[PDB]
Amino acid sequence: IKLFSVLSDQFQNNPYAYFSQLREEDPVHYEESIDSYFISRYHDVRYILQHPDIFTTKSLVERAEPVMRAKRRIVVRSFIGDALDHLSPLIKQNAENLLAPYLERGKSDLVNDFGKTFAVCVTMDMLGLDKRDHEKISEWHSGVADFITSISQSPEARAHSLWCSEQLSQYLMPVIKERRVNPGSDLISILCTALSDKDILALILNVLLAATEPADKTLALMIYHLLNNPEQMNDVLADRSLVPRAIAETLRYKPPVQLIPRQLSQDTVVGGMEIKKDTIVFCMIGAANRDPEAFEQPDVFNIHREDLGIKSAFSGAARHLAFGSGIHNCVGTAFAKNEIEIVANIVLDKMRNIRLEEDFCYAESGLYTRGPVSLLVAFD
Ligand code: HEM
Numbered sequence: 001i002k003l004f005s006v007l008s009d010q011f012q013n014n015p016y017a018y019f020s021q022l023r024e025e026d027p028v029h030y031e032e033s034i035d036s037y038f039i040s041r042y043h044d045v046r047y048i049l050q051h052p053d054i055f056t057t058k059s060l061v062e063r064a065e066p067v068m069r070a071k072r073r074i075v076v077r078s079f080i081g082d083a084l085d086h087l088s089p090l091i092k093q094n095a096e097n098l099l100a101p102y103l104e105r106g107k108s109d110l111v112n113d114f115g116k117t118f119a120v121c122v123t124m125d126m127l128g129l130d131k132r133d134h135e136k137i138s139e140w141h142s143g144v145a146d147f148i149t150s151i152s153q154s155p156e157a158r159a160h161s162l163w164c165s166e167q168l169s170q171y172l173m174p175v176i177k178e179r180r181v182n183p184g185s186d187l188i189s190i191l192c193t194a195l196s197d198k199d200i201l202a203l204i205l206n207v208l209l210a211a212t213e214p215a216d217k218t219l220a221l222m223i224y225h226l227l228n229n230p231e232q233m234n235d236v237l238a239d240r241s242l243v244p245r246a247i248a249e250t251l252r253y254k255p256p257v258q259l260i261p262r263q264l265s266q267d268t269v270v271g272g273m274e275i276k277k278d279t280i281v282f283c284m285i286g287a288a289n290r291d292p293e294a295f296e297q298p299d300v301f302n303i304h305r306e307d308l309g310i311k312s313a314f315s316g317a318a319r320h321l322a323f324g325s326g327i328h329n330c331v332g333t334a335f336a337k338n339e340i341e342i343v344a345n346i347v348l349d350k351m352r353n354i355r356l357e358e359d360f361c362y363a364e365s366g367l368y369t370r371g372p373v374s375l376l377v378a379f380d
């Protein structure tokens, strides 16, 4: 009951089976393993995200370090909002260039054969990095992600993770010193116009981390749930203007980012239980997006739901909390919509009569960020 742990293999197997017992029965669940509380109720979670004075979180220029173990937001957001119209042909090519090898076979794994690389490549365009280097970059990003997400690492993984983030610095740092004097129109160049080299590397790195994982996760998650609800897929195929709805419901239904940490600046009460200073709470987004106080039939994937509030699903005043909520809302919400919309449409254009593979076994993994282990599809 309160004896159960949200860091367990058991929980990590299927977080969705325990959210309900978590609200209603132990909403502000203490995690003995750390000095961290886990908050499962929608309205609590949302109050926490709306009030980042009481519940602070790291700056964009703060080098990330393992989650388990304020004016630039706009400068990023806008110069990401100005970016997306420019990067749409490049996102489109990436999708086409990366699908290209797999057509003809009529067989792909949208996660491992395509997704990861696609997202990596879109971010590399956002940062103006040379897409020849996408193998190195992916491997490096992954090693770092591994260090941030993980509960624990072996000395090897940790030694690899250190290496990866060493390599990235060796790679990006010369690009930063270059663009300071010869800036293109890419994000790195823009950041050089009022922060230090190392500051900018941190921001760049946090934008590398932020903009990659969730985007490939969502693509795969949406396609999977559309295929798992095939008339909703047909709905989307016959009217492509539903893709924002399919995207939004996927985000509500299986948020790629499951946990949003916040540090407590003071003593304060969320719900009923009292929590002391400097302790860190964890917003359980999965649990909040499945809360029947916010959504009706919450455990039903329905792209046509009336309370989705599609009108706003890709903003800070949204109904689901997959981008967070309010002032500290995902900086690339507008970007994320476009990116996924584009690629989805191409995936759907090129993979005619797309379906799941014979004897494919769906499986999610992740505690802090969660998505499919793979998505084995077949098509003409
Ligand atoms: C599938 C779509 C995406 C989802 C669900 C998502 C989710 C999130 C969430 C939950 C946060 C936490 C905000 C908070 O602390 O309350 C966040 C932060 C952030 N997001 Fe996103 N994201 C997505 C795509 C993107 C993309 C494509 C970009 C960049 C274009 C982006 C840029 C950022 C940045 C820069 C942060 C700040 C984190 C930091 O301080 O390092 N996101 N995102």
Ligand SMILES: [Mg+2]
Residues within 6 Å of the ligand: 154, 155, 156, 158, 159
């Ligand atoms: Mg080591």
Ligand SMILES: [Mg+2]
Residues within 6 Å of the ligand: 225, 228, 229, 301
């Ligand atoms: Mg389903």
Ligand SMILES: [Mg+2]
Residues within 6 Å of the ligand: 229, 230, 231, 232
């Ligand atoms: Mg159906």
Ligand SMILES: [Mg+2]
Residues within 6 Å of the ligand: none
């Ligand atoms: Mg499932």
